[PDB]
Amino acid sequence: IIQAKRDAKAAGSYYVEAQHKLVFVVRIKGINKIPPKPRKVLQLLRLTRINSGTFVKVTKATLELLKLIEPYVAYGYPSYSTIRQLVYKRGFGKINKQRVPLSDNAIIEANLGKYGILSIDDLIHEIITVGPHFKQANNFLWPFKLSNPSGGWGVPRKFKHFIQGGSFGNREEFINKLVKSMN
Amino acid sequence: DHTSKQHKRSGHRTAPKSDNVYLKLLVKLYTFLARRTDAPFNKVVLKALFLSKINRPPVSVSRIARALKQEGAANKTVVVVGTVTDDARIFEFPKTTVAALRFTAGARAKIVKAGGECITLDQLAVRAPKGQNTLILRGPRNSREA
Amino acid sequence: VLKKNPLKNKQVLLRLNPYAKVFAAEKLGSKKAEKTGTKPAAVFTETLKHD
Amino acid sequence: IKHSKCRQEFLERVKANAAKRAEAKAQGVAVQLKRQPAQPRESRIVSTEGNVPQTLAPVPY
Amino acid sequence: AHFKEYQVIGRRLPTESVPEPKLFRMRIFASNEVIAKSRYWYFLQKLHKVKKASGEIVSINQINEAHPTKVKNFGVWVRYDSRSGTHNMYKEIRDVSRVAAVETLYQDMAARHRARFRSIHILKVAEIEKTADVKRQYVKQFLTKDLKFPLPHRVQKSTKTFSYKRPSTF
RNA sequence: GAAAUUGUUGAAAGGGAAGGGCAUUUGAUCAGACA
RNA sequence: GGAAUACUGCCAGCUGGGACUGAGGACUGCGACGUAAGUCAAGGAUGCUGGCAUAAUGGUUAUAUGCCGCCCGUCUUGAAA
RNA sequence: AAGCUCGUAUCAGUUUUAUGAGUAAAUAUGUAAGAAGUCCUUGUUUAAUUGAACGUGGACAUUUGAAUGAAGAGCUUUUAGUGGGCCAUUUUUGGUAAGAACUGGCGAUGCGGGAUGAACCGAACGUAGAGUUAAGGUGCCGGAAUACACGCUCAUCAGACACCACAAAAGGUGUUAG
RNA sequence: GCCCUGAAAAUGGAUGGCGCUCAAGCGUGUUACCUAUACUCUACCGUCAGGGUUGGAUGCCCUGACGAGUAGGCAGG
RNA sequence: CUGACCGAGUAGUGUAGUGGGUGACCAUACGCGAAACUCAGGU
């Protein structure tokens, strides 16, 4: 990507990165006083409780859902390091009906080898590099229970758009910093 | 946050309401068989044992003959979880083995006369641990006034 | 009984991913790049500094 | 009272999907008849060789 | 923290019969790339018929100051929306760089006019190389040759809460 | 031979209320075990 | 024309100090260091040392102080009224 | 509450695809996204088994007909309390200064903040240990910077943080900038 | 933009008080700080759910989620 | 009687602020988004 950018710049052209196919969404507001529409949208995304997030496939259907829950969630484009740290620290794989930690590659293999994923690294690759079995891996991963950001959210008031100096909204590149503090 | 009920109980029974000692022994035996055999027959028999008296209508001896007339069912063993009641409407009873919790005096006498052999559920399980060559008959439920 | 955390206690990290041992050999984080003389095009530079 | 193209297009798409399934069974290939939502646009190279990028300078006031 | 300058170019994503639009560009001041892109979209939507859904940012690059260490008299034209109808405003700020000049302008507008960031429009900022064309007295006074002034009533800061010397100024 | 109420002796506190909750200092009192 | 620094992100880079927790209870499993024997920071604390062996720690209560606490039941869309 | 029959189960207070409904949007409202479906052939009211209808032969099993999520779906018996509630938001009407339609709260609600509050901002509650935050604050009462940086105020009832219990036009030879 | 009038009553009174004027007032920007029964990590009681157990069976072990509440229902004491 | 970077991203509208304003009202960010109208063609 960087080589293509340099070539375009040196040849009187402006290379544009492909629109990100993966986003990370973290709940920012509580349960009380949530209108039914955003409440149902968050429920479908498995954002049961505040300071919890899940990986969402970037699609026009999911984009419209995110548009509705915009005031209540903060999301962006996670980096490889952030995804790896999340999977290694808060990585809990869904088994029949219980939340079991991914403490060994054997556990992942016994419940996700049907699709060729048999190790935590393979799951991380499928998540960051959205593949055909992205939905299966995303559903298999339990929603991440994230702590509050160490050092504060960095804004006087959370309930404002990121463009307006708040916390929610689109923080595409700054989502990694928030995730690292919250992880 | 929650989406379903805070705490939801299972929609199936665990132990019979009756305190009969012998019935509980059969329940224990069938639970062990179902857990260590996974046979659908054992699971069905275990589930039927938890049904109440109303939900366990008696099966007439004529109804046993009804099933035995099916193609290939002449030699199948008939298992009735409830009680087998006699029926004078049938004048000839095919010679067959019947397994049930309780057998009425008339039904037992008719079965013995017809060359059959009344048997308890435990004996049937001993003969058929996996429920092979077994037939299950459930008595009419709409018959009871409701 | 207790969930141990990767990124520290390197035994668990090596258990989860044997490639971590190979990662350390070259360290896979400080690899030297290759310099190139791809000077930016005149149009881009003119449009950047100028309005 | 209501009878519109809503269902007619569904049957037309069903027929098209059946034809595509027949084609993919005759020739080895993924059936690919499952509709997919609009996907993000891929990367591409844009050049200003044709027209210089003008500056708007939001003067209107 | 400090404001950043980004060059933002929009494409107005092409389609058949509408290929390769003119690639409009703008100069945007913002603290981060996201805010710069949002402001660029806000200006573009008002200027002509374009939208974020039907457009994309061709490229964003930070415009570093050519001479970060040099005193310049920056001429500023700003349209600010007060409680009543908005009106034009021309200001001059003696600063070291465009970023610093814009940062000082924002504070000056917020203080002397209560104009918030939402209501501030940056029409144009241009360095004034000439000297005879300066029109604002408060910046002109600083251009006098060999200018020297004192700092009367200097006040010091004390770490301890109690002082025995009863300090003085200068 | 109970409580409401009262007197004697011992202890404690009390500047227009008392009583209660988390938390500790001081006074009194108290059970247990030591190849 | 030759460089750094600033900003930014990465390091399955190193390391000092402080706080809480010691839950499980003979082995079985996943891993690392070793030619091997074996060892280990690898599915939950071990090793050594000192004082006391008693009102020393600790419980009950009298009372000292940091903060809080409105008067019980019924009724009322609502009460301390 | 008691449960009964089935079980991967069809579903969804949500989006996307297709289009009705509207000089006429937006929000919503209606139907579908098929295995209980599609196709070739063929048996038992039209002039004609021409066709409807239900069967047999044959072709496709699951990228099988969009996304996401689902402590499963349906079914039977019976019953304790309420059937007058109050506050807040949007639309409509009325109006110098209340009546109908929507959704969220209190009533049934603790905890932090607004010195207190039922309608407010956070957040909904097992008993404990450590850490990070929300709103709210960093002169003392009151735990936190008499923190940093840019501009304005002399007020003889200044000023001091939405709901809070709230005034402007206008006048001033007060003051700052256009 | 800031200030006075515009905004006149009756016991004495309240940005909450003390109190403050390059504010400890006003608009805005930048940092570190205090914490709720909220969030993150862990110990324990209980409810629920999924498994193991023929060698105190309603018994014992492992795993996962949760604990608001008036009228009222059930269950265990 | 059709196409259009044509009205116009205008009117209008869902969502959020301890946003401004005594009030009337207004601006911002996440979106949707027209018609009459204009040019040409049609008849």
Cβ burial of D22 (10 Å; 0-12, 13-18, 19+) is exposed
Smallest CA–C1' separation from A88, nucleotide: G12
| Angle of CA points D38, E34, E101, to nearest 5° | 155
Look at the block and give the residue holding tokens 């109440």. Answer: B52
Structure tokens at A74: 């903060």
Is residue E83 included in any domain, yes or no? yes
Architecture of the domain spanning B12-143? Ribosomal Protein L15; Chain: K; domain 2 (3.100)
Q: Could you tell me if E120 and E141 lie in one domain?
A: yes
- Confirm or reject contact between B1 and chain A (CB < 8 A): yes
Both structure tokens of E38:
């949002």
D41 inside 8 A of chain A by CB: yes
Q: Which residues pair with A74 in a beta bridge?
A: A26, A169
Contacts of D39 (CB under 8 A, 6+ apart): A21, A59, A60
Chains contacting C (3 or more CB pairs within 8 Å)? A, D, E
Contact assessment for residue E126 and residue E74, using Cβ atoms and an 8 Å cutoff: yes
Q: E133 and E117, same structural domain?
A: yes
- In whole angstroms, how far apart are CA E122 and each of A120, D56, E114, E154? 51, 12, 16, 37
Helix, strand counts (H, E) of chain A? 8, 8
**Does residue E88 sit in the same domain as residue E108?**
yes
**Nucleotide closest to residue A157 (CA–C1'):** H135
Length of chain B: 146
The tokens describing A104, both together, are 């060994």
* C-alpha span between B139 and B56 (Å, rounded): 7
Helices (H), C1-51: 10-16, 19-26, 42-49
For strand G, give the nucleotides within 7 A of a protein CB.
9-14, 23-24, 30-33, 40-44
Q: Chains touching chain D at 3 or more Cβ pairs under 8 angstroms?
A: A, C, E
Cα–Cα distance for residue pair A51/A147, rounded to 1 Å: 6
Instruction: Give, for E61, the enclosing helix (H) or strand (E).
Output: strand E57-62
Residue B127's contacts (CB-CB under 8 Å, 6 or more residues apart) are B119
State how far the alpha carbon of B42 is from the alpha carbons of B10, B47, B55, B56, B68, in Å: 20, 9, 19, 17, 21
Residue-number span of the structural domain to which E84 is assigned? 69-145
Q: Is the domain of E64 the same as that of E85?
A: no
Q: How many CB atoms lie within 10 A of CB A54?
A: 18
E-state strands within chain A: 13-16, 22-27, 52-57, 73-76, 92-95, 98-101, 144-145, 169-170
Of A1, A16, A20, nearest to D46 by CB-CB distance is A16
Q: Quote the CA–CA distance of D48 and E10 in Å, as a whole number.
A: 12
Which nucleotide is closest to C39, CA to C1'? G1
Assigned token pair, A3: 């080589």
Contact residues on chain A for D47, CB-CB shorter than 8 A: 8, 11-14
> Looking at the structure, do residues E45 and E74 belong to the same domain, yes or no?
no
**Helix, strand, or coil (residue A38):** helix
Strand ranges, E, within A49-133: 52-57, 73-76, 92-95, 98-101
How many Å apart are D11 CA and H50 C1'? 26
Cβ distance A19 to D40 less than 8 Å, yes or no, reads yes
Tokens of C39: 């000077």
Handedness of CA A104, A106, A111, A113 (dihedral sign): positive
Whether E60 and E105 share a structural domain: no
Q: Contact, E47 vs E90, CB < 8 A?
A: no
Q: Which of B108, B5, B13 is nearest to B51 (CA)?
A: B13
Among E68, E97, E114, give the residue marking a domain's end.
Answer: E68
Pairing status of strand A22-27 against strand A73-76:
antiparallel
Co-location of E104 and E80 in the same domain = yes
Under an 8 A CB cutoff, do D55 and E26 touch?
Answer: yes
Instruction: Tell me if A40 sits within 8 A of A72, measured CB to CB.
Output: no
Residues of A in contact with C34 (CB under 8 A): none
E37 and E101 fall within a common domain: no
Task: Give the CATH number for residue E99.
Answer: 3.10.20.10
CB E1 within 8 Å of CB E31: yes
CA of B1 to C1' of H127 (A): 21
Of A26, A24, A27, A28, nearest to A155 by C-alpha is A28
Angle at B92 between CA B88 and CA B96, to 5 degrees: 110
Residues 142-181 of A with CB under 7 A from strand J: 157, 159-161, 163-164, 169-170
How far: E162 CA to I21 C1' (Å)? 23
Distance from CA of A24 to the nearest CA of C (A): 21
DSSP-based three-state secondary structure for A96: coil
- Residues E90, E135, single domain; the answer is yes
Longest dimension (CA), chain A: 57
- DSSP state, residue A70: G
Strands B97-103 and D44-47: unpaired
- Nearest alpha carbon to residue E63 among E2, E123, E6: E6
d(CA B96, CA E116): 96
The token pair that represents B32 in the structure block: 């062990």
> How many structural domains compose chain E?
2
Q: How many CA atoms lie within 13 A of D21 on its CB side?
A: 8
Alpha-carbon distance of B137 to B67, in angstroms, equals: 8
Chain breaks in chain D (C to N over 2.5 A) after: none
Q: Which of B72, B64, B118 is nearest to B90 (CA)?
A: B64
E160 located within any domain: no
Cβ burial A28-40 (10 Å sphere, 16+ → b, else e): bbeeeebeeebee
Tokens for A83, please give them: 């995804």
Contact (Cβ atoms closer than 8 angstroms) between residue E149 and residue E160: no
Residue A142 CB partners (closer than 8 Å, separation 6+)? A92, A93, A94, A99
Structure letter (DSSP) for residue E143: G
Say how far apart CA A82 and CA A140 lie, in whole Å.
Answer: 19
Chain A contact set for B3 (CB, 8 A)? 43, 48
Q: How was this structure determined?
A: cryo-EM
Are residues C16 and A88, on separate chains, in Cβ contact within 8 Å?
yes
Q: Are residues E60 and E80 in the same domain?
A: no
Structure tokens at A5: 């950018």
Chain E contacts in chain C segment 1-51 (CB below 8 A)? 47-49, 51
Q: How is chain A split into domains, by residue range?
A: 1-183
Q: Is A31 on the interface with B (CB under 8 A)?
A: yes
> Which neighbouring-strand residues pair with E60?
E8
d(CA A79, CA B81): 63
Do both E61 and E110 map to the same domain? no
Q: How far apart are CA E64 and CA C45, in angstroms?
A: 12
Report residue A43 as tokens.
């429920």
Token pair, residue A157, equals 């008031």
Q: B35: which 2 tokens?
A: 């857990």
E84 shares a domain with E53: no
Six-digit token pair at E140? 């002109």
Count helices and strands in chain C by DSSP H and E runs: 3, 0
